[PDB]
Subunit: 284 residues, 4 copies
């Protein structure tokens, strides 16, 4: 009843599209072209707070990406629509992008774009395995899917300073992540600022589990990780980010030593029906 | 006791805005020792962002990050730690001063964003419209922009224009978006409420929302538009204006959003000037 | 005794082309010490450009810079000193290898150009047409691409496609530009003389102009198109083909120039392989 | 009867170079109808490249594509069909004029390259050295730049500087690369033969290689450097200079290549002016 956000491993190639609603009067023609194409597998769709506000509607649990008043930067760059394309090669995704652009215009204007790819079967560009402690199976459904079959996804485009980080001694890299790069073993003696120490899913009250589908990226803006986290609500992601940002106990996550998010967005993933994507709470 | 430059009558012919992230806080003293003697408030202005204050465990009354507006239009919040405003003679001089500031601020600060700005004609937006007609001048500008202690609070947005769409509209449709006539800059009393000058009428707020604007056009690989800059004695004037423009006051959205949208957003505290340079004392005391 | 990976069909799913300028030739020995142990001719291929040979005061028979064609279409000559062809499993591996090669090759070499390439739909151009159908295979490929001493001479062009224009044409007009039918790749004998496969028919030259092509699609901020690569036992095959495509043989210009244009052009000598690595002796002897 | 603006010294504070590819030559008439009335030779100069002439099956004496130098340094040849030189008061005016020229010139022409250029400190390179000290002036400039029929032949290269490397050199080493003293622009008679002014000494050639340079610094995403422009009554002066700079005359390479390298290269024919606009008659019967 949900989309294909739980399919593991992440595809070898993906592309993230973010649109601004520039001409709301042309919205019906855009939806008529877009909605029949959203199968939740090769094409996923997320709805942003501006689109809901433009329709004068309300989605329980939906809100723009938050504003954290911290010593580290987490920008809020909320858009109206997020499209997640998954495919076989980057050329297919490029041609599919052009078709979606022309089909969504003039109602929607493309505001941002990111090509993403799987690295070495699921590693960050720093080399560390990504997704080790993700919930799987039925635990993944309970962490990511709400009762009505919808999901709430958070997105950040993290930009890595690879030259600084990879020039550190391997023990210093391991103390930033909280795991050993050589064999992915957890470092129990890592400082409290270590990433996996900051984001330990069982260390929150209530527990802050989420389903992450992050993928590395690289273009003219640099290189890093396209962070994606699916949850039954934004509660899990938001308390994690606030602890990572030092807003819980004053200790800042080690990731901010070498990486920084360039964007931030919240999106509501609608459920699927027997006849396509179920946007009924928005179109009545 | 302010920094001046921000009140200097016309905008300089060329300027450059630099935005830095506080990447290594342990190296901050050396960066400040190199930077502060160069801040004269005329050729080089400085603004302090909320992350820098938070990293020092201090607090500046009136300072906060760029707000989050839950509206039908997009106003992103992209707050950085430090804002440097270079004003100069040519773009090459500003480029060379930029490189020198980068080496002096490193490794404590990492350059996060940059925009070259230039004066167009006598002070016009790239659409052709005059910019600054109803700005406060003289003592009214000081009262609107400068707080009692001599500091100022500046808001910044990098607006990106869709010039092809806007300039292809009939001139009457362009005029109804701005609220003034491009042919002679006359105000249109019969413009719809969504017109920009109707949305931002400084006397139509309670209390009055006057501010001192120093916007300048820009153009690079990201496109072209207006680098919007608004100085105030507090952020109240700018923020109540932006919320009305975004339709959060009465449901009417400003006409600017038909062809333009901001890519960035930042709040910065402009410290006052003392007899011996920039006064950063509320951040460097005990 | 050649660089085996130039005959590998199909091309790997991901590759990256690097082009370096010899910026400080006095620092060449340290760069070669780091580079040569990595050149296996499979995951990393190497080509030597005429500027590098001239900087050493030597000569390579068959090597010369990319030619200058005085035609009505543009084939720019952007010859560099070194060409590296990286092939790998995913784009991230090639990115990390690029950074390592950049730091190891410095300061002697400066990276002048870079292109990420990928296989599309099993070996198709971004326009949809199959690429490589009439490539020589087996022993014929060796005879067309490999010189007697085991070296090869490779020509490179970065072609930029106007996909919106081309794909908006009626399918019959697209087919007459390529010379083959998109529906089933069958050759059109009744295509106009300007059709690509009519221009480049390898048996229609005297002597025959066979070559081994390893082109791969590309896409970045500059646009999208085909990273054209042609291996030959000499540059004779490629050059007579390009001159006919450019209308310098019979006044008829190839149809590809209706929607695509090369942004770069380079000639590079691929040295032979020995039992213990790349054989650069004709360049570092005596 | 030339395009006045090419002798205007100093160059205006802001300019923009546009280079177009002839993508659809059948659509050329509508493009020329829109373009030619705008070419005054002052705010808008025009140069014709060899591909445009070849596409019309014509020939211009003295015109040819940018040469191919087989040297140890890189001078790329990136010849285009059309060169437009916009000059104005601010970068925004040039930006709006560029968009208008793009829409008017399409679909025949496609914009292939663009460079914003600006005057630095009254006429200095970004390295600080004065640029234009030994340019011909007055009637000597006319004799060096203008052919008999009033046309000119202009060479263009987009030079990219490595300012970090160059400005980190000792001041004596910087001076030996240029051949002049940065403090007061005095000529260094004891500078090495590789020094720029020693390589390019206009009187040290037979015949003499004088030309009128109108170079201006530039800066965008590709870096920063000098947009080199040289006007001559023919291409002989520029080409014999460049071959010496590249070490093809005596094996000595110009010191500029230690910190700078050209990214583009083009030759263009600047048609003469008549009393009623640009004279393209040798190209349109
Ligand atoms: C540059 C950005 C990031 C990088 C490179 C990164 C990388 C990693 C790595 C290598 C692990 C350990 C392997 C694993 O369990 O998957 C991990 C764990 C985790 N990360 Fe991140 N991550 C990033 C951002 C984030 C953010 C922003 C959040 C939440 C707001 C987050 C939440 C988590 C969680 C929940 C875990 C699992 C913790 C556990 O072991 O229970 N990650 N991350
Ligand atoms: C693309 C962005 C913008 C453009 C092109 C633009 C342009 C203009 C123009 C042409 C005028 C009329 C001439 C003048 O009074 O100076 C004006 C007035 C004004 N604008 Fe904007 N502006 C932009 C953004 C903003 C924003 C974001 C704000 C506030 C949050 C703002 C506040 C004002 C105010 C206060 C006035 C004077 C209104 C009055 O007459 O009292 N502007 N603007
Ligand atoms: C935008 C640039 C180009 C594209 C999209 C392209 C595409 C194609 C396609 C679709 C074919 C037919 C299938 C095949 O046999 O491979 C082909 C054939 C061929 N191409 Fe190209 N090509 C390009 C540039 C070039 C250039 C510059 C040359 C030579 C200088 C060249 C040489 C050949 C040859 C020799 C053949 C085989 C001809 C034969 O049937 O005997 N190609 N190309
Ligand atoms: C990065 C590229 C270049 C830079 C920064 C540069 C800069 C300079 C400077 C500082 C001078 C001395 C002051 C003056 O008399 O103008 C000069 C002189 C000169 N340059 Fe260049 N130049 C460049 C490229 C070229 C090229 C490519 C040519 C010719 C092909 C050239 C030809 C000349 C000539 C003829 C002179 C005058 C020599 C004399 O007779 O004294 N320049 N240039
Ligand atoms: Cl989704
Ligand atoms: Cl940056
Ligand atoms: Cl400028
Ligand atoms: Cl000086």
């Amino acid at each position: 009843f949900q989309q294909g956000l739980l399919l593991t491993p992440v595809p070898a190639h993906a592309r993230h599209l973010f649109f601004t609603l520039q001409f709301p009067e042309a919205l019906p023609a855009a939806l008529d072209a877009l909605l029949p194409q959203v199968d939740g597998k090769q094409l996923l769709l997320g709805v942003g707070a501006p689109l809901v506000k433009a329709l004068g509607r309300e989605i329980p649990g939906l809100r723009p990406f938050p504003l954290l008043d911290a010593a580290v930067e987490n920008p809020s760059t909320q858009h109206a629509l997020w499209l997640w394309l998954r495919g076989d090669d980057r050329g297919e995704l490029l041609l599919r992008t052009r078709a979606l652009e022309q089909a969504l215009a003039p109602a929607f204007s493309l505001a941002d774009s990111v090509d993403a790819f799987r690295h070495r079967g699921g590693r960050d560009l720093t080399g560390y395995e990504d997704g080790t402690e993700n919930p799987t199976g039925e635990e993944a459904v309970q962490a990511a899917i709400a009762l009505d079959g919808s999901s709430f996804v958070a997105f950040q485009l993290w930009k890595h300073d690879l030259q600084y980080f990879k020039a550190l001694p391997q023990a210093e890299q391991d103390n930033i992540i909280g795991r050993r790069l050589s064999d992915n073993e957890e470092l129990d003696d890592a400082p409290a600022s270590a990433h996996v120490k900051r984001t330990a899913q069982e260390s929150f009250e209530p527990e802050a589990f989420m389903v992450r589908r992050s993928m590395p990226w690289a273009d003219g803006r640099g290189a890093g990780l396209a962070f994606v986290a699916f949850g039954k609500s934004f509660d899990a992601f938001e308390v994690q980010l606030r602890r990572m940002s030092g807003l819980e106990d004053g200790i800042i996550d080690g990731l901010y030593r070498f990486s920084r998010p360039l964007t931030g967005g919240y999106y509501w993933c609608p459920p699927m029906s027997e006849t396509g994507l179920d946007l009924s709470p928005l179109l009545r």
